[PDB]
């Protein structure tokens, strides 16, 4: 039956069954290693029952986020009620502060978003489309911070609690980096950035879903400002180039671990001693890893196999190791109370504000820059305001744009590093 | 070959000059992240550029096992020496002892190996295997107590400090047991036991890796010792059932992470509170390992392409994360100041005899009952006197042989128990 | 990572009350499991109480059963040790250390505060 | 209340900065799991963490010291002391819910 074939995280009912009698066996009898093992031991067992709970619901999977969301909150509910035996939290806590494989996460995912960019696409970008994404930037935060003082939210809040969260890369790459930088740079607590910021990114993320049909609907509406489905305007394009990817062996998919953490390093030298403060403001070695990757990808030294395979290994963090991320996110940096005062009337009126602001700002500057102003808006706003790679295809697929998915990826992944050395910046700036 | 088209570790020497310079700037400005994400990537550079090294000196290629012999070496020297600071140190440790990584490379491989075979060859492998480690055990003890009536060292002195402490399990579990059960049986000291015990145990542990390459360039010049890979004799492989299995995509090697991680969660949950001891005799949770991934095997819950998904994770673990691992041992898991401070000749010819005598009982044994001597001495010959499951790995590495490592941890972990049970009949016996 | 007593201390009469404190910052304070260790003066250290997160489980050494109360408040990132009917034994610096289980077992130690206790 | 009792042997060490210094902790009774602890503690000052497992090091310590043993004997040998590694240090176990600390044994110049 049903009953019996029914798949939790790719394991038949029973096997997974299994799996839960050996947590249940370690919670009862109190015996656990505090360490990476019995760390991904627990935490594999609860992402994998709640993101089946969270992905498996009609409404909450398709607009609210899916998995890593109700894998999150129901972890910070289990730490609330205190239903975690002590051991448990030393586990989780082990393996995401004191073994950090939190950072791990982290520079995998960056590296594996910045360096899987092609080259040319990447050196072409820099040229005017880049500047498209930076320029919806500013004016998702203009418009956020007048709205901000109409409703009397101070200026340094909107700009670091509520426009940097929402042109991110969502929970993954993007609310979980902007935190940890908000926490090294300012020093006050993070749980409070992190749960007040989910709820804003959640809420830009439904909105950037309704404004993709209505930016639709107007661009069916009014020709001079659209286009059928063609970011560039009156250029050719005639014929572009791309190397193609022999083969991705297991030494290439761990050639990405190798850049993944020796970039890594490498931020962390220059951010730790080469180079505190650029100016009179600090940077955290987040922003400098993305300096890095992109300039070791401009560089060229990687071969296209080694790019796909830095690509390939982010996916499996991504896809497959981001419900563990999700459970010790849940448990580390999760506030039930500050996500439960987030969401309000004014907080759902800002984040709409902010996404208008980057859907101006975006068309803007793509009719500055020689692009049609209705793809420019998705492609440098929209996709930008989203939950990462999992908001560009829903946000494209609301649209009949498929054409554009290329260009929502570039968005989405680099501008998720731009807006890491931004937050770094305004954090350090602000305060 | 060309000094730019050449690729060490599959980087190009400009691409892994740039990882060098990383390191090289991380060890002189004295910043390193002492944690996971900043602990691999000295792991990597290190063993990349050693094993590159190791596997192209002329006669160390083949002769004394290359590249993680290498490693190993070169590791424990640089430790020795004083060049890694005390950061680096710091993060080796960090991510092999502090977060176990050994455990989960140990668990991950044992998984692999034990769910990729067929169920029905399962207990008629195993019935074979325990009376070869015994004969082994006791062929090692004859060339033992004849190499101390050689140097004059009598009988009860070569049993209680060289042939026990070598076939025990290791330095966890072998040589502190053995440590106390010796103080508990005589009354004398017993941190004077152990700091002789340790030391012993390391060289036999080298000698094990130098005479495993060599009974792996034995078994290549003559075909009928060695049957390459499985050690059964396979007279009864010609049935080779087998079964097809569909394409598996990234979500079957992380099931088979999970199956890897929470089997040791169970297991480590029974051997420590519910059945901790069979007898008198302590069980380490890597037995039940082996125990419940074969339970599970023959349950036949997990589907084909599970287990083709766990195969592939432990070929990924096995053939690119290896020489992390052995940068790891050799920091960690290997003190050369003690083997420098407590080497002669006397313990040096003591323990190679020991060693060579273990590696001809266990051959005898193996050839006498169905097994394929070279596999049946490079486990249960040699992976008995090496230093715990970090020794099995060395030797099984050195020997291009990671198939067995079910049966080394089988033959490490029981033959420990066994040999405690030796040493407190022993003890008494001769005193 | 810092930890602060910072609280009480000073004199009390014998019989008579007292409460501390423990400003823990720079980490999680809430998910550690927080103790109280205290140390006679020339004498070696002795454990007093310890409490999970979320205050799930409090004991007590057996001396100081039913005499003390510990207490956290993980909004505001503190830790209360509640003395009553304190005594001439009962005077010590009194370190509240963070207990991480296997993985370091006292890794952080506050300033501990000076309790004289006497007529 | 059957608590664990530690007691370190060597009351006091009285010696030379360059030598060793094999410390010593014996428990009443089985210490499970070799939960045990040492820590260092300067004069005027909070204890520092050293060998938080029975075996495995801290953080900033150095490669010398080193704990060992299991049961209900422990030892803690420094391999070569140092002017600055002159203190006091406690055996401290945490295998039960009453964790126990030792006596004190102080190494002295």
């Known amino acids: 039956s049903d009953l019996l074939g029914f798949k939790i995280f790719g394991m038949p009912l029973p096997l997974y069954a299994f799996a839960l009698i050996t947590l249940l066996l370690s919670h009862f009898y109190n015996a656990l290693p505090t360490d990476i093992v019995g760390g991904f031991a627990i935490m594999f067992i609860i992402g994998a029952i709640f993101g089946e709970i969270g992905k498996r619901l009609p409404i909450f999977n398709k607009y609210i986020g899916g998995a890593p969301v109700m894998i999150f909150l129901v972890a910070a509910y289990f730490v609330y009620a205190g239903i975690f035996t002590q051991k448990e939290i030393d586990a989780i806590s082990n393996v995401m502060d004191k073994s950090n494989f939190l950072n791990l996460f982290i520079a995998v995912l960056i590296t594996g978003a910045i360096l899987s960019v092609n080259r040319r696409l990447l050196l072409k970008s820099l040229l005017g489309y880049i500047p498209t994404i930076l320029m919806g930037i500013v004016g998702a935060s203009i418009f956020g911070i007048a709205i901000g003082l109409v409703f009397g939210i101070p200026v340094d809040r909107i700009m670091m609690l509520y426009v940097l969260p929402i042109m991110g890369g969502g929970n993954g790459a993007g609310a979980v980096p902007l935190s940890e930088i908000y926490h090294s740079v300012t020093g006050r607590s993070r749980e409070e950035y992190y749960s007040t910021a989910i709820a804003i990114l959640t809420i830009a993320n439904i909105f950037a879903i309704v404004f993709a049909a209505v930016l639709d609907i107007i661009g069916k509406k009014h020709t001079w400002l659209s286009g059928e489905g063609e970011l560039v305007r009156k250029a050719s394009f005639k014929v572009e180039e791309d190397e193609k990817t022999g083969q991705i062996t297991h030494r290439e998919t761990a050639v990405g671990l190798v850049l993944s953490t020796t970039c890594f390093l490498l931020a962390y030298v220059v951010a730790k001693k080469i180079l505190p403060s650029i100016g009179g403001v600090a940077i955290h070695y987040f922003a400098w890893m993305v300096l890095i990757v992109a300039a070791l990808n401009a560089s060229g030294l990687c071969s296209p196999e080694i790019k796909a395979g830095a690509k390939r290994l982010s996916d499996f963090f991504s896809k497959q190791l981001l419900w563990v991320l999700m459970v010790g996110v849940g448990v580390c940096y999760t506030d039930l109370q500050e996500i439960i005062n987030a969401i309000t009337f004014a907080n759902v009126v800002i984040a709409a504000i902010i996404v208008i602001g980057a859907v101006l700002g975006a068309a803007i500057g793509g009719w500055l820059m020689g692009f049609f102003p209705i793809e420019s808006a998705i492609t440098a706003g929209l996709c930008m305001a989203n939950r990462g790679g999992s908001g560009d295809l829903e946000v494209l697929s609301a649209c009949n744009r498929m054409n554009l998915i290329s260009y929502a990826q570039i968005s989405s992944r680099l501008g998720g590093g731009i807006v890491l050395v931004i937050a770094s910046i305004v954090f350090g700036m602000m305060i | 070959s060309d000094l730019l088209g050449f690729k060490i570790f599959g980087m190009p020497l400009p691409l892994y000059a740039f990882a060098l310079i990383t390191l090289l700037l991380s060890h002189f400005y004295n910043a390193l992240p002492t944690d996971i994400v900043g602990g691999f990537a000295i792991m990597f550079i290190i063993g990349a550029i050693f094993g590159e090294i190791g596997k192209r000196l002329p006669i160390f290629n083949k002769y004394i096992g290359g590249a993680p012999v290498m490693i190993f070496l070169v590791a424990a020297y640089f430790v020795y020496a004083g060049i890694f600071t005390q950061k680096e140190i710091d993060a080796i440790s960090n991510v092999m002892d502090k977060s176990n990584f050994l455990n989960l490379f140990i668990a991950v491989l044992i998984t692999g190996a034990i769910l990729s075979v067929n169920r029905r060859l399962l207990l008629k492998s195993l019935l074979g295997y325990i009376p070869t480690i015994l004969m082994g055990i006791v062929g090692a003890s004859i060339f033992g107590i004849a190499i101390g009536l050689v140097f004059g060292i009598p009988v009860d002195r070569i049993m209680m400090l060289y042939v026990l402490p070598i076939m025990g399990g290791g330095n966890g579990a072998g040589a502190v047991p053995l440590s106390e059960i010796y103080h508990s049986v005589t009354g004398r000291s017993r941190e004077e036991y152990y700091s002789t015990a340790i030391a012993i145990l390391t060289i036999a542990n080298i000698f094990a890796i130098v005479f495993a390459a060599v009974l792996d360039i034995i078994g290549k010049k003559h075909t009928w010792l060695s049957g390459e890979g499985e050690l059964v004799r396979k007279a009864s492989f010609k049935v080779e059932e087998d079964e097809k299995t569909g394409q598996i995509t990234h979500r079957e090697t992380a099931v088979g992470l999970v199956l890897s991680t929470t089997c040791f969660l169970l297991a480590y949950v029974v051997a420590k509170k519910i059945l901790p001891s069979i007898g008198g005799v302590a069980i380490h949770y890597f037995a039940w390992m082996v125990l419940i991934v074969a339970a599970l095997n023959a349950s036949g819950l997990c589907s084909p392409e599970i287990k083709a998904g766990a195969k592939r994770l432990s070929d990924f673990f096995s053939k690119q994360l290896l020489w992390v691992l052995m940068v790891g041992v050799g920091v960690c898991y290997t003190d050369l100041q003690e083997i420098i401070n407590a080497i002669t000749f006397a313990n040096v010819v003591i323990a190679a005899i020991i060693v060579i005598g273990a590696v001809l009982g266990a051959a005898i044994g193996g050839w006498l009952m169905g097994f394929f001597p070279i596999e049946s001495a490079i486990t249960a010959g040699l992976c008995m006197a090496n230093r715990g499951g970090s020794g099995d790995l060395e030797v099984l590495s050195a020997c291009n042989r990671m198939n067995l490592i079910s049966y080394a941890q089988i033959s490490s972990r029981l033959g420990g128990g066994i040999v405690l049970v030796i040493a407190s009949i022993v003890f008494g016996m001769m005193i | 990572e810092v930890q602060l007593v910072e609280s009480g201390g000073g004199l009390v009469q014998p019989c008579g009350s007292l409460r501390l404190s423990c400003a823990a910052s720079?980490?999680?304070?809430?998910?550690?499991?927080m103790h109280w260790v205290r140390q006679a003066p020339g004498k070696g250290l002795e454990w007093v109480s310890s409490?999970?997160?979320?205050?799930?489980?409090?004991y007590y050494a057996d001396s100081v059963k039913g005499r003390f109360t510990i207490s956290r408040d993980n909004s505001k990132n503190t830790l209360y040790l509640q003395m009553n009917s304190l005594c001439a034994e009962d005077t010590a610096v009194y370190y509240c250390?963070?207990?991480?289980?296997?993985?370091?077992?006292?890794?952080?130690w506050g300033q501990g505060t000076l309790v004289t206790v006497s007529s | 209340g059957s608590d664990i009792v530690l007691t370190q042997s060597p009351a006091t060490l009285s010696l030379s900065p360059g030598e060793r210094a094999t410390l010593s902790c014996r428990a009443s009774?089985?210490?499970?799991?070799?939960?045990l602890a040492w820590y260092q503690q300067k004069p005027g000052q909070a204890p520092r963490l050293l060998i938080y497992?029975?075996?495995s090091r801290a953080t900033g310590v150095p490669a010398r010291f080193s704990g060992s043993g299991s049961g209900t004997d422990f030892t803690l040998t420094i391999s070569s002391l140092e002017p600055e590694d002159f203190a006091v240090y406690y055996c401290?176990?945490?295998?039960?819910?009453?964790?126990?600390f030792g006596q004190g044994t102080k190494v002295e110049i």
């Open positions: 250390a963070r207990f991480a289980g296997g993985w370091g077992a006292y890794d952080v």
């Open positions: 720079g980490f999680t304070f809430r998910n550690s499991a």
């Open positions: 409490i999970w997160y979320s205050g799930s489980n409090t």
């Open positions: 009774q089985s210490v499970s799991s070799n939960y």
């Open positions: 497992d029975s075996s």
């Open positions: 401290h176990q945490y295998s039960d819910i009453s964790p126990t």
